[PDB]
Design a protein around this ligand. Sequence first.
Ligand SMILES: [Zn+2]
Lengths: 101, 64
Amino acid sequence: GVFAKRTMTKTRRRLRDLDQIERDLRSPRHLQQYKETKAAEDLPGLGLYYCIECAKWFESETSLVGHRKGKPHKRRLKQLKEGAYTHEEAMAAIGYRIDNG
Amino acid sequence: KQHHMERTYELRGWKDHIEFLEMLARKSGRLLKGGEPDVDGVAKQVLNDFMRGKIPWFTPAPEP
RNA sequence: GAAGCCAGAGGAAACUCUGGUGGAGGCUCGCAGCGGUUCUGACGUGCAAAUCGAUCGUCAAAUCUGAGCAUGGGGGCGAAA
RNA sequence: GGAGACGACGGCGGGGGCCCCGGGCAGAGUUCUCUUUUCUUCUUAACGGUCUAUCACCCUGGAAACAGUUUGUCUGGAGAU
RNA sequence: AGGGAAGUCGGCAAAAUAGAUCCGUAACUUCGGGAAAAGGAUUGGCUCUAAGGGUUGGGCACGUGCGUGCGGUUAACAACCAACUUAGAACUGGUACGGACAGGGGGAAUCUGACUGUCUAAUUAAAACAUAGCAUUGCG
RNA sequence: GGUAAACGGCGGGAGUAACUAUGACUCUCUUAAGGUUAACGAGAUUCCCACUGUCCCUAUCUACUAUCUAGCGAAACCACAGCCAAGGGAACGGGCUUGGCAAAAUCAGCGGGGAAAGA
RNA sequence: GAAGCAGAAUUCGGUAAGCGUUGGAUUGUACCCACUAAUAGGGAACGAGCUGGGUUUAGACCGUCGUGAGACAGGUUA
Ligand SMILES: [Zn+2]
């Protein structure tokens, strides 16, 4: 079940993208800046329990462990394993490169 | 007085009013959507208790 | 998930705790039924001299209901308008 | 003296009927491909005979190291197993 | 679309929530409740695994298939039959997995009537009526 | 005489005075109550989160009408009729006066006026 | 047009109605806030469009008055 399915595609309901999630996984600085874009006191569990791969905060460690057992987390696993779609992949699809001399 | 507030709410250890309201919200379940504490509602509860006398307080008389 | 009942752990006993079982309540969600809360509702020489739609209250009882009978107007009957 | 002759509710057990599944005969349908396939009939009344069916009761016997036992704790020297 | 009550006497109406499993649940309280409080994690398909059952059956010795006197609790074993639940695992599609249907929005307070119930059929369902509880009166 | 979980009402006593009833006037005590509001509710009110066409600010789609046709077919209402401006003492004008003006017969809407509320 | 009106910003007055004159808060009951060039004032009602108060049929409660039925200094609900 998805909460408020009719306005899920609104811009104010937009979620973090998979390429951003890959950048957070590869570099801790990107994840850090995404965390100063949020208030720590307003997060579940004081922001101490967080899934980078699903980009979601949880109330407890047992909640995070229960999350790691489910299907949305495993779909995020398989999507990250396949790899997110990026601008370089978009250019390689049409066979376009950048000449920097 | 601090001990009266701690006895009233069974709650202690805050450093300021913001942390006091936050831990009171987490204890009483006054949470918004997404696990965010309801500091406004908890502050309204505290003010209601203050003016309704659930929280003991007084103004000391001037010394002669 | 009330009494009653079983097992285990303690406690000198009385009792205490835990896991069950059980199926009580003018308890509760809710279908029928019964009722009639709300809608700038429909309808307003209407299907209807009170109907229609969605919503709502109640649903094991102080629940709903047929037939036979009783009380007849300065009267009856009324959880009383 | 008995029958006529008697409340409501809860779980449990037996039986009839309905529902479900398998094989067999016959008939029908599908069949580009698949489906030893899917569907239809396969019934036995009142009234009687016979053999059995919870409760209960009777006989032997006398139970603690208490036992029999229901989903639900009732029964037993006033005689249990 | 963007904003999210700026609308309006007034969130009227609409939207949002909703089934089931698991984590968790405050004040107050007549200790019975509040409570489905609040706040969260999941839910498709396929292929598997595991658990939860029933029926029947013990060996000698004699007399003669029976009866007896025994012996013996590894039947902890064999054969046959049977249906629905529960839990765990891998794989896989996805924009969605109670995919239609069905289906609580919730919280902080205040006044009010104890509650369940009843009434003005055809403008008012309510702090009205009734109710148990309490008290008084008359009558041997 | 009694009686206030009867209706009601919210102090007492002394001094002064001495038929009856009253009052006035001083004086004095002046007091029942301090350190369970749950549950339930189509009851009334304020606020918060979520949520949204409530609104900025409106747009588009569907069905049934409304529309046209064949058939069928009323009712309300009706002194007579229906363009206005100024005056028409009885602060009324659709008819009178003075002007503006004014061209057959029609259809769909509309709610200003007339008409229309078991008014 | 006039004013110590240097400039900037104005103030007072005149002709002028061509063109505009907003968005909100507060009902324990008309003033505040902001934007703006500005947030000017009135008439056609106050000498059967819709909707909230004055406002008030029938139900009900509290307060005052009345022996009472009831009435009201009144307040609340549908
Ligand atoms: Zn995750």
